[PDB]
Design an enzyme around this catalytic site. Structure first.
Site, PDB file in Angstrom:
ATOM      1  N   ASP A  35     -17.777  46.815  72.618  1.00 59.72           N
ATOM      2  CA  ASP A  35     -19.193  46.683  72.298  1.00 59.72           C
ATOM      3  C   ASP A  35     -20.037  47.793  72.922  1.00 59.72           C
ATOM      4  O   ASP A  35     -20.389  47.720  74.113  1.00 59.72           O
ATOM      5  CB  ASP A  35     -19.684  45.313  72.767  1.00 59.72           C
ATOM      6  N   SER A 199     -32.162  59.067  64.044  1.00 61.37           N
ATOM      7  CA  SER A 199     -31.720  59.557  62.751  1.00 61.37           C
ATOM      8  C   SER A 199     -32.861  60.326  62.083  1.00 61.37           C
ATOM      9  O   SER A 199     -34.028  60.010  62.256  1.00 61.37           O
ATOM     10  CB  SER A 199     -31.240  58.393  61.872  1.00 61.37           C
TER      11      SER A 199
END
Length: 330
Positions: A35, A199
């Protein structure tokens, strides 16, 4: 040193991935959920409330000659999906795919919430976010990667998740055969303890690319792609019959529909998520309504590049003094 381990979807939808991890002496092998969105290594154990164990493999510290109680230490964690667990702490030897850490904090669950009990395939989590998120008290503990870092040939690990197929986590090296083209690296903020990056925008199917900054986290421990409501709306508007269902808790679509791809920007580079990756099957057995793999992050408070996005790429988690993230197509 290096390590290399195969990671396997737990089910036919890729709801999560498990990776075998050796703990203790003799080795006890548990299948853990790696994770990059959390920082605790915790396991089902001999100490877990019996009624809360249902098919999981447990760690038994008393059977490990290298296990040592971390005296006074406790941990307690709550995840974004509402699940939780808590307990005490041992240090022990932990190996992943040939890579061995001695003195790793292994957090032994005394209590786990329902969703963990109900998932027989996941024996615990191995956190790979930054150690500043680790919940052990009074002395915060380091992640497996942090402990291994200095010994690694290169201070990196990589995630290469498969679509309906096994993939690979590598530690300490970049497998240049595992991706196409070049790896594009992008800046990381560690200020919230996550692999947080920005992004450069998105496209829906064959549509034109929209340049827009989308701050989010690279999170192998989250199944879906959670993005701003504007983005998500623009995606599902291209799917006939798609709608946001409050009763279901997000966007659903007729299983007979064709899903367009979704492209996200990494610097000037582009990662394309094929439409098929965005299909998470019937909302209930036999239903013709399918759950979407791109959902709104509104009210999560952060955008999450989960498995839907990450499995379309070869991803480098670069733990150099200034951490960065790399993405390549594959």
């Amino acid at each position: 040193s290096t390590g290399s381990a195969t990671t396997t979807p737990i089910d036919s939808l890729d709801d999560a991935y498990i990776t075998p991890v050796q703990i203790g002496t003799p080795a006890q092998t548990l299948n853990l959920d790696f994770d990059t969105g959390s920082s605790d290594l915790w396991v089902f154990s001999s100490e877990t409330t019996a009624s809360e164990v249902d098919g999981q493999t447990i760690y038994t510290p008393s059977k490990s000659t290298t296990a040592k109680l971390l005296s006074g230490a406790t941990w307690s964690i709550s995840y974004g999906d509402g699940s939780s667990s808590s307990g005490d702490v041992y240090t022990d030897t932990v190996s992943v795919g040939g890579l061995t850490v001695t003195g790793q904090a292994v957090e032994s669950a005394k209590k786990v919430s329902s969703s963990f009990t109900e998932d027989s395939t996941i024996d615990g989590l191995l956190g790979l976010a930054f150690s500043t998120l680790n919940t052990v008290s009074p002395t915060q503990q380091k992640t497996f990667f942090d402990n291994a870092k200095a010994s690694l040939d290169s201070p990196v690990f990589t995630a290469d998740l498969g679509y309906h197929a096994p993939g690979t986590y590598n530690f300490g090296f970049i497998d240049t055969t595992a991706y196409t083209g070049s790896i594009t690296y992008t800046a990381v903020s560690t200020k919230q303890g996550f692999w947080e990056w920005t992004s450069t925008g998105y496209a829906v199917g064959s549509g034109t690319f929209k340049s827009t900054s989308i701050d989010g986290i690279a999170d192998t421990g989250t199944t879906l792609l959670y993005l701003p409501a504007t983005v998500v709306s623009a995606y599902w508007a291209q799917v006939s019959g798609a709608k946001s269902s409050s009763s279901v808790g997000g966007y659903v679509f007729p299983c007979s529909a064709t899903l367009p791809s979704f492209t996200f920007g990494v610097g000037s580079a582009r990662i394309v998520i094929p439409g098929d990756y965005i299909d998470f099957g019937p909302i209930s057995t036999g239903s013709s309504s399918c759950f979407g793999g791109i959902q709104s992050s509104a009210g999560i408070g952060i955008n999450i590049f989960g498995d839907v996005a990450l499995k379309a790429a070869f991803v480098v988690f670069n733990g150099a003094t200034t951490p960065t993230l790399g993405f390549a197509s594959k």
